[PDB]
Amino acid sequence: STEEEYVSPRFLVADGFLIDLAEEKPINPKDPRLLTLLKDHQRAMIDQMNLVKWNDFKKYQDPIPLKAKTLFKFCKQIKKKFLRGADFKLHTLPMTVLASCVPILLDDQTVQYLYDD
DSSP: OOSOEESSSSEEEETTEEEETTTTEEEOTTOTTHHHHSOHHHHHHHHTTOOOOGGGGSSOOSOEEEOOSSHHHHSOOEEEEEEEOTTSSEEOOOOEEEEEEEEEEOTTSOEEEEEEO
C-alpha cells in the first residue's frame, strides 16, 4: 500500500518499505536485528503488510525506480551519478545525471539505490 502504516514509535511502513525513523533509512523486513528491536506482535503486523522482498534486488544491475508517495520524506539521501538511458530511467556507470538516491545494504553486502520515479 501507499498509505503510511504505524509499526512502533521507531518504525513506519511506506511505499512497500519498512523505515527506521531513528536511523532515517529503510531496513530489510527480514533483518535479523528486528527480533530484538520489535516485539512479536509488531513483526506479525509486518507479515500482514506485503512489503518488498529485498532478495529480489540481488540481480538488479541498475538503481531501483520507485513510484513512491512518502518514503523519501523519511530517508537520508545522497547524490550519485548515473547514466540516463533512452528508456528515460537511470543506469549504473560502466548522458550522465546526478540523482538524489537512498542507499540500501543487502544480504550479500551489495549496495543498491532507491530513487523517486
